[PDB]
């Protein structure tokens, strides 16, 4: 049983999300009183989301049991292990930033009352936290109760455009098939992700 | 001027992207994102897109005949065919930069446990094909990966949308007992830059020692 709350200034972006799990999307601007962003102290390009609005939003939504998830390019890596870890949480709150990010004090303040996880979903830059939220939600929820690269998969027909399914997969020999698949996995891993087997990246 | 075609059995999942595009860029002909329902190319009354894996095992595999027809209609010789997969080459910022100058991206979104490998292998005999992973976690299908790829690429296309960056701060100068680091208000911009650099080094050591 999991509750997921997503906070964003673009709630519409989260529509792709659609009894053992409930997911709610909140418009951050609901906690304003008049602008959610301003220029950075110390200078630099772009804008930073003000801590004040976030503090009030999170005050209302989070408890001490909450795991606060903050997507950011500068985060710890979100991996499959992370997904397994979070899959048994009662309450995830995902704080989606925009512009150049969120004032650091939001996470620091929250960390005094709850567990906080700043995470990156990969080494590329998004325009905001929303797409990362969608990725995180999908990877976690598919694990809720209720390494190596996988090799190629095939289905019917056995011959297509003059391209044959590898004959071993048609042979019915479970041992020879398990062996071939293991080999295909290790070969693909060497080629595409040598780091997974402890080798230098290309 | 970039065309993006996305093929998926869940076209509604890609709704955020098309909304995410400002009208100015579309009307300037800078970008056009089209989403296609894969079932348009099914052959049977049951609109079947999947079938059991050869060699056995769990899950299902998407049919090559359906995908073949779809890509035949949508792709040209100039297409960069992007196929999200947990087993793909890593999609990185360098990739996003490379793809940002492409004329035509076609993103083939799998579901179930993936697409019959002959689809990509056949396509690769007449166009450039890139099987890519967006991170070391498993999704339910290619659609979320397509969203990420589209967003990361398009924000690098003019006017369409190393160490870790350190913390950012804005008003107010004091909030819930926490002060903005005084150096940032010092007006010593050489010192500010060095402070930021050290924050960056520190954060990279703590969170991403792999980058060092
Ligand atoms: N794994 C992953 C996570 C994200 C992500 C998550 C939340 C937000 C909120 C705003 N942005 C946009 C954003 C932020 C910082 C910069 C500036 N930085 C300097 C160097 C690299 C970039 C540019 C643009 C997010 C991005 N992207 N990728
Ligand atoms: N970077 C990234 C990309 C994706 C992605 C992309 C396309 C599809 C199409 C179907 N699926 C779901 C899915 C579920 C289980 C298996 C089984 N495999 C065996 C063990 C590991 C997994 C494969 C595939 C996708 C996933 N996920 N993560």
CA–centroid distance, A133 to ligand 1, in Å, is: 13
Q: Do B116 and A40 touch (CB under 8 A)?
A: no
Contact A122 CB / ligand 1 (< 6 Å): yes
Q: Which ligand is nearest to the CA of B92?
A: 1
Nearest CA of chain A to the CA of B149: how many Å? 9
Are B82 and B105 spatial neighbours (Cβ–Cβ below 8 Å)?
Answer: yes
Per-residue buried b or exposed e for A41-53, using 16+ beta carbons within 10 Å of the residue's own CB: bbebeebbbbbbb
- Residues at the binding site of A for S-adenosyl-L-homocysteine are 71, 97, 120-122, 124, 126
- Residue pair A87/B59 in contact by the 8 Å Cβ criterion: no
Domains and CATH numbers, chain B: 2-155 (3.40.1280.10)
DSSP assignment of chain B: -EEEEEEES-GGGGHHHHHTS-HHHHHTTSEEEEEEEGGGG--STT---EEPPTT--SS-EE-HHHHHHHHHHH--TT-EEEEEEEEEEEP-HHHHHHHTT-SEEEEE---TT-B-HHHHHHHTTTSEEEEEESSSS--SSSHHHHHHHHHHHHTTSTT-----------S-SEETTEEPPGGGGSS-HHHHHHHHHHHHHHHHHHH-GGG-
Is B137 assigned to a binding site? yes
**What is d(CA A86, CA B23) in angstroms, rounded to the nearest whole number?**
38
Compute, in angstroms, the gap from residue A57 CA to the centroid of ligand 1: 21
Per the document, the length of chain A is 202
Q: Position of tokens 């042979």?
A: A171
B138 within ligand 2 shell (Cβ under 6 A) = yes
Is residue B113 within 6 Å of ligand 2 at its C-beta?
Answer: yes
Whether residues B65 and A40 touch (CB distance < 8 A) is answered with: no
What's the first-to-final CA gap in chain A, in angstroms? 43
Neighbours of B41 (CB within 10 A): 21
Q: Which of A44, A56, A86, A105 to mutate to test the interface with B (most CBs of B within 10 A)?
A: A105
Work out the angle between the directed axes of helices B143-154 and A130-141 (0-180°, nearest 10): 160
DSSP H helical ranges for B86-172: 93-99, 117-123, 143-154
Show the tokens assigned to A34.
Answer: 């008049």
Alpha-helical (H) ranges within B36-188 are: 64-74, 93-99, 117-123, 143-154
**CB distance A70 to ligand 1 below 6 Å:** no
From the CA of B137, the nearest ligand is 2
Determine whether the annotation assigns residue B134 to a binding site.
yes
Which residues of chain B neighbour A181 with C-beta distances below 8 Å?
55
B105 CA from centroid of ligand 2 (Å): 21
Give the separation between CA B1 and CA B81, rounded to whole angstroms.
Answer: 17
Q: How far is CA B143 from CA A93, A174, B98, B137, in A?
A: 23, 33, 21, 14
| Closest of B69, B53, B3, B38 to residue B141, by C-alpha | B38
Residue A58 contacts residue A8 (beta carbons within 8 Å): no
Please enumerate in sequence order all residues whose Cβ is within 8 A of that of A51, keeping only pairs 6 or more positions apart, or say none: A102, A103, A105, A106, A109, B170, B172, B175, B176
CA B93/CA A82 separation, integer angstroms: 22
Q: What are phi and psi of B174, to 5 degrees?
A: -135, 130
Answer yes or no: are the C-beta atoms of B99 and B153 closer than 8 Å: yes
Q: Cβ–Cβ of B137/A135 closer than 8 Å?
A: yes
Shortest CA distance to B29 belongs to which of B21, B17, B38? Answer: B21
**Whether B135 and A121 lie within 8 Å, measured CB to CB:** yes
Contacts of A137 (CB under 8 A, 6+ apart): A4, A6, A17, A23, A94
Q: How far, in Å, is the centroid of ligand 2 from the Cα of B32?
A: 27
Residue of the nearest CA to atom 25 in ligand 1? A128
* Ligand nearest to C-alpha B90: 2
Name beta bridge partners: B3.
Answer: B32, B104
Interchain CB distance below 8 Å, B56 and A160: no
Is the dihedral angle over the CA atoms B127, B158, A73, B163 positive or is it negative? positive
Q: Extract the tokens encoding A30.
A: 């609901």
Residues paired with A118 in a beta bridge: A70
Q: Is A20 exposed, middle or buried (0-12, 13-18, 19+ CB in 10 A)?
A: exposed
Beta bridge partners of A93: A5, A68
As a whole number of angstroms, the distance between CA B107 and CA A70 comes to 28
Picking from B59, B55, B203, B27, the residue whose alpha carbon sits closest to that of residue A101 is B203
CA distance A50 to A35: 9
Ligand 2 neighbourhood includes B86 CB (under 6 angstroms): yes
Q: Judging by DSSP bridges, how do beta strands A163-164 and A115-120 pair with one another?
A: unpaired
Burial class (CB in 10 A: 0-12, 13-18, 19+), B162: exposed
Distance CA A119, CA A122 (A): 9
The sign of the CA dihedral B159, B160, B166, B169 is positive
Residues constituting chain B = 212
Per-residue burial over B181-204, b = 16 or more CB atoms within 10 Å of its CB, e = otherwise: beebeeeeeeebeebbeebbeebb
d(CA A14, CA B20): 12
Residue A198 neighbours by CB distance under 10 Å: 6
To the nearest 10°, the Cα dihedral for B147, B149, B151, B154?
Answer: -140
Tokens of A59: 């005050």
Measured in whole angstroms, the distance separating CA A116 from the mean position of its chain's CA atoms is 15
CA distance B49 to B67: 8
| Break-preceding residues in chain B (C–N over 2.5 Å) | 161
């Amino acid at each position: 049983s999991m509750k997921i709350d997503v906070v964003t200034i673009f709630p519409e972006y989260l529509q792709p999300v659609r009894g053992l799990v409930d997911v709610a999307v909140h418009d951050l601007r609901r906690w304003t009183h008049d602008s959610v962003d301003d220029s950075p102290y110390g200078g630099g390009p772009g804008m930073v989301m003000k801590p004040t609005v976030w503090g009030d939003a999170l005050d209302e939504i989070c408890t001490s049991e909450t795991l606060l998830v903050v997507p950011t390019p500068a985060g710890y890596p979100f991996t499959q292990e992370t997904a397994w870890q979070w899959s048994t949480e009662d309450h995830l709150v995902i704080a989606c930033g925009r512009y150049e990010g969120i004032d650091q004090r939001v996470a620091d303040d929250a960390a005094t009352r709850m567990r906080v996880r700043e995470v990156s979903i990969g080494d590329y830059v998004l325009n905001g936290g929303e797409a990362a939220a969608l990725v995180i939600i999908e990877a976690v929820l598919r694990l809720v109760p209720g390494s190596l690269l996988e090799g190629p998969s095939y289905t019917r027909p056995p011959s297509w455009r003059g391209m044959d399914v590898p004959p071993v997969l048609l042979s019915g020999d479970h041992a020879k098939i398990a062996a071939w698949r293991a080999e295909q996995s290790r070969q693909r891993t060497i080629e595409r992700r040598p780091d997974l087997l402890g080798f230098d990246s290309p």
